Design an enzyme around this catalytic site. Structure first.
Site, mmCIF file in Angstrom:
data_model
loop_
_atom_site.group_PDB
_atom_site.id
_atom_site.type_symbol
_atom_site.label_atom_id
_atom_site.label_comp_id
_atom_site.label_asym_id
_atom_site.label_seq_id
_atom_site.Cartn_x
_atom_site.Cartn_y
_atom_site.Cartn_z
ATOM 1 N N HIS B 49 90.600 11.348 34.207
ATOM 2 C CA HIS B 49 90.472 11.831 35.569
ATOM 3 C C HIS B 49 91.185 10.886 36.532
ATOM 4 O O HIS B 49 91.706 11.308 37.567
ATOM 5 C CB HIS B 49 88.996 11.966 35.914
ATOM 6 C CG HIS B 49 88.785 12.474 37.291
ATOM 7 N ND1 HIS B 49 88.504 11.632 38.340
ATOM 8 C CD2 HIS B 49 88.828 13.729 37.794
ATOM 9 C CE1 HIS B 49 88.350 12.348 39.432
ATOM 10 N NE2 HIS B 49 88.580 13.631 39.131
ATOM 11 N N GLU B 52 94.900 11.723 36.571
ATOM 12 C CA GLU B 52 95.175 12.899 37.380
ATOM 13 C C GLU B 52 95.437 12.521 38.839
ATOM 14 O O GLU B 52 96.344 13.094 39.440
ATOM 15 C CB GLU B 52 94.026 13.891 37.237
ATOM 16 C CG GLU B 52 94.233 15.207 37.973
ATOM 17 C CD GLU B 52 92.975 16.036 38.222
ATOM 18 O OE1 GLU B 52 91.976 15.858 37.476
ATOM 19 O OE2 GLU B 52 92.983 16.848 39.178
ATOM 20 N N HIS B 53 94.725 11.505 39.363
ATOM 21 C CA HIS B 53 94.933 11.023 40.730
ATOM 22 C C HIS B 53 96.284 10.322 40.847
ATOM 23 O O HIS B 53 97.046 10.571 41.784
ATOM 24 C CB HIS B 53 93.841 10.032 41.176
ATOM 25 C CG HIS B 53 92.527 10.647 41.505
ATOM 26 N ND1 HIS B 53 92.013 10.636 42.783
ATOM 27 C CD2 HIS B 53 91.628 11.301 40.741
ATOM 28 C CE1 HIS B 53 90.845 11.245 42.793
ATOM 29 N NE2 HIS B 53 90.588 11.663 41.553
ATOM 30 N N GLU B 122 93.062 3.893 44.609
ATOM 31 C CA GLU B 122 92.378 5.115 44.181
ATOM 32 C C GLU B 122 90.980 4.768 43.692
ATOM 33 O O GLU B 122 90.088 5.614 43.641
ATOM 34 C CB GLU B 122 93.042 5.785 42.974
ATOM 35 C CG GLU B 122 94.186 6.710 43.320
ATOM 36 C CD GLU B 122 94.030 7.599 44.538
ATOM 37 O OE1 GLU B 122 93.457 8.690 44.398
ATOM 38 O OE2 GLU B 122 94.529 7.207 45.608
ATOM 39 N N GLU B 129 83.924 9.679 45.326
ATOM 40 C CA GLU B 129 83.729 10.990 44.724
ATOM 41 C C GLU B 129 82.399 11.030 43.976
ATOM 42 O O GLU B 129 81.783 12.089 43.874
ATOM 43 C CB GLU B 129 84.835 11.283 43.713
ATOM 44 C CG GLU B 129 86.070 11.946 44.291
ATOM 45 C CD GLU B 129 87.126 12.259 43.245
ATOM 46 O OE1 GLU B 129 87.538 11.327 42.513
ATOM 47 O OE2 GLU B 129 87.512 13.438 43.145
#
Lengths: 85, 438
Positions: B49, B52-53, B122, B129
């Site tokens: 994940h 993906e960022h 990030e 998140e």
């Protein structure tokens, strides 16, 4: 002071996650031998005085009373019985 | 009758699969990868994940800003999602902007910078998140459902990963993940809409030819999960709506019972008080729930993975004193898949599914998603004629036999969130998985 399911009367609950597993997935007697020996010993040790002190006291009182009663109704206890009545 | 899905391979083993529609003017091209969070271990959980960022944070050529501009100039958009078993990166564009989009996708997958400065930036975004998924109740419920059903197993982990890992993910482990997993034999280049297959194969030869092949190429959609009957209760009295999921272990993509499980799922079906037609649906559970106001909604699901699945229902309700009835009536409807279903329900569900499986694919993104999903789970696109034949093969005996071995008297995984004081303990829920009268 008690409601029913859905409105039992609990203060609002928030922030607790509870977890458990199926009775079919678990060993019901897991840790039984440890419990039976060590857990029972701990629980019994911590309560022993509350049983031993009154039981031992009242057994001693009874023992003394019953032995005196027995002695008063022998030949040897004639005189002491006469005074006691 | 839909146009045929064309399929070609490259030398490295990259599959190209396309379905043209000369009636649309847009095209969805993208890369479906047979890889996801489940490929991580406990230490690098969250990596897929995280990548993906970073995939959108700049490449060896285009910087972050140049990347933004290049896509803006294309006219369409790029999109990505990482699941437990699948990762997707796609680009929706105009017909003649397809070579640009293939080039950008090839760049962000093969040649991404993964610069320590960007990792560090990030690392805070992803940390935020973790505290905002909390609002998406359906997702909270399903992530707890996987965590408990597959307790301490890879399918049980979340996609975001723990907070601890987010703070310790390095560019090294990111690079290692995508080098081990994003291999040509695990990837499918998919085009749907206004695409020519032969054009797409040429673009694949131009951009994805220097992809590594894995040492041991297994077929696409190749995987041992041990389901745990269990419950998570997340009681929150301040929420007005209870969200409850109940599931049993379901079927994998390639199970022999895959269609039988879909038909059984359609017999219970879905319900939503906000839709006008829902009060008139034929499903027995629908009728019970609507007449008695037991729920705002319910949605039956049959989620599949390579080697397991979860089959169950997700309920939402404000009726907090009758949660017990809602759960009771739902599980008594499941009992009837074992004891009572006949040709009446089975043929009705088959009718509804024969159309439903075709109706779902109503745009280029849905078509691309269907080609990509089927190629990465089954190794082939299954034609509607084959699908119509497999559905037709489902009898009432098949449904009864499946329910008797999958549902009847079986352990469930149960998650409740919200005002769930009225949800009884595990035993009373699990006792409704059978009927003493049968």
């Amino acid at each position: 002071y008690m409601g029913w399911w859905g409105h039992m009367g609990s203060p609002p609950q928030k922030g607790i996650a509870g977890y458990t597993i199926s009775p079919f997935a678990a060993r019901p007697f897991a840790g039984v031998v440890h419990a039976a020996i060590f857990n029972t010993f701990r629980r019994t040790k911590n309560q022993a005085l509350f049983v031993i002190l009154p039981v031992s006291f009242f057994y001693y009182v009874w023992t003394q009373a019953s032995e005196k009663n027995e002695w008063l109704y022998t030949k040897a206890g004639r005189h002491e019985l006469a005074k006691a009545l | 009758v839909s146009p045929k899905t064309r399929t070609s391979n490259l030398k490295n083993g990259l599959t190209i699969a396309s379905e043209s529609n000369p009636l649309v003017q847009t095209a969805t091209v993208g890369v479906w990868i047979d890889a996801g969070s489940r490929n991580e271990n406990a230490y690098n959980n969250g990596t897929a994940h995280f990548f993906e960022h970073l995939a959108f944070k700049g490449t060896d050529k285009r910087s972050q800003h140049q990347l933004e501009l290049d896509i803006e100039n294309m006219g369409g958009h790029l999109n990505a999602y990482t699941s437990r078993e699948s990762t997707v990166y796609y680009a929706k564009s105009f017909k003649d902007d397809v070579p640009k989009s293939v080039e950008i996708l090839a760049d962000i997958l093969q040649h991404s910078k993964l610069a320590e400065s960007a990792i560090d930036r990030e690392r805070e975004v992803i940390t935020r998140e973790l505290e905002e998924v909390n609002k998406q109740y359906e997702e909270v419920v399903f992530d707890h459902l996987h965590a408990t059903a597959f307790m301490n197993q890879p399918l049980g982990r979340t996609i975001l990963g723990p907070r601890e890992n987010i703070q310790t993910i390095t560019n090294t482990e990111l690079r290692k993940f995508i080098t081990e997993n994003y291999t040509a034999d695990r990837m499918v280049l998919v085009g749907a809409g206004a695409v020519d297959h032969d054009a797409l194969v040429e673009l694949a030869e131009k951009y994805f030819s220097h992809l590594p092949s894995s040492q041991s190429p297994v077929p696409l959609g190749t995987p041992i999960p041990n389901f745990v009957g269990s419950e998570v209760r997340l009681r929150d009295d301040t929420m007005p709506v209870a969200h409850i999921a109940i599931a049993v272990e379901g079927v994998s993509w390639t199970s022999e019972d895959y269609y039988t499980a879909l038909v059984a799922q359609a017999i219970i079906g879905n319900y939503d008080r906000a839709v006008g037609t829902s009060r008139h649906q034929g499903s027995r559970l629908s009728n019970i729930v609507s007449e008695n106001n037991l729920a705002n909604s319910f949605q039956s699901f049959s989620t599949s993975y390579s080697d397991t699945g979860l089959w169950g229902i997700y309920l939402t309700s404000e009726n907090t004193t009758q949660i017990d009835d809602l759960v009771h009536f739902t599980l008594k409807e499941w009992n009837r898949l074992s004891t009572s279903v006949s040709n009446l329900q089975v043929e009705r569900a088959k009718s509804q599914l024969k159309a439903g499986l075709l109706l779902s694919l109503d745009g280029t993104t849905y078509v691309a998603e269907d080609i990509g999903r089927q190629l990465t789970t089954l190794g082939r696109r299954v034609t509607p004629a084959e699908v119509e034949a497999k559905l037709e093969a489902v009898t009432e005996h098949d449904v009864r036999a499946w329910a008797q071995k999958t549902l009847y008297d079986k352990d469930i995984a149960l998650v409740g969130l919200g005002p769930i004081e009225g949800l009884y303990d595990y035993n009373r829920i699990r006792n409704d998985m059978s009927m003493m009268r049968w």
